[PDB]
Write a protein that binds this ligand. Sequence first.
Ligand code: PW8
Ligand code: MN
Length: 222
Amino acid sequence: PLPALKLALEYIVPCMNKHGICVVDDFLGKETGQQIGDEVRALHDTGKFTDGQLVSQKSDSSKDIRGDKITWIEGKEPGCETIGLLMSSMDDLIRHCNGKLGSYKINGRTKAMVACYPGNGTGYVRHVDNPNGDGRCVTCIYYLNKDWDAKVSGGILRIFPEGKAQFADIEPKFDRLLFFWSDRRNPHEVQPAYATRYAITVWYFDADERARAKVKYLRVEL
Ligand SMILES: O=C(O)CCC(=O)Nc1cc2c(Br)cccc2cn1
Ligand SMILES: [Mn+2]
């Protein structure tokens, strides 16, 4: 990589505090990024993903249109070792940011949500990742698509930063890491993808929000 600390202190912290959206290119390098790509493609090829989000439910069921496919990855599974390394590297970054990302104190994360857009013209509608205060404060996405050309293949992640009249368009480029605030500051969508598009997402939890979300959404026997 490039030292997690240099990346965090000189780019990720100031850019997150200023814009709420931060892009790091060439995060792990070609050899590691390619190993991750190999692992994700292996998962896909061996059937570990779901069939995909039901986008249009037709009268017939062979005609149904399915979109983003997913699998949850802990990073310790056999054949997911390098995914685990990515997750450790994301954690290292976040660790070096803590106390500096807004007023958040990050104390945990989800497992990795690995997504595959099959390349059938499906995307992902505009949404907010954490609209209801469930404790997720930062979304972290790693992209693995070598030689992606959005003009040909689509698949741009378009973010609609609150209060600004502008789009932030992020191509799902190989070895690119994206951070953005998970709440309503950053509604976003994925534009239709016409080639197979892979991404690995982790969400980091703010300790306080997560603690009260547990109060909100809920046990010991008497
Ligand atoms: O690939 C990218 O560029 C990011 C795409 C993205 O926004 N994925 C995503 C998936 C979700 C699912 Br599945 C369930 C609930 C919330 C979700 C929020 N976001
Ligand atoms: Mn999202």
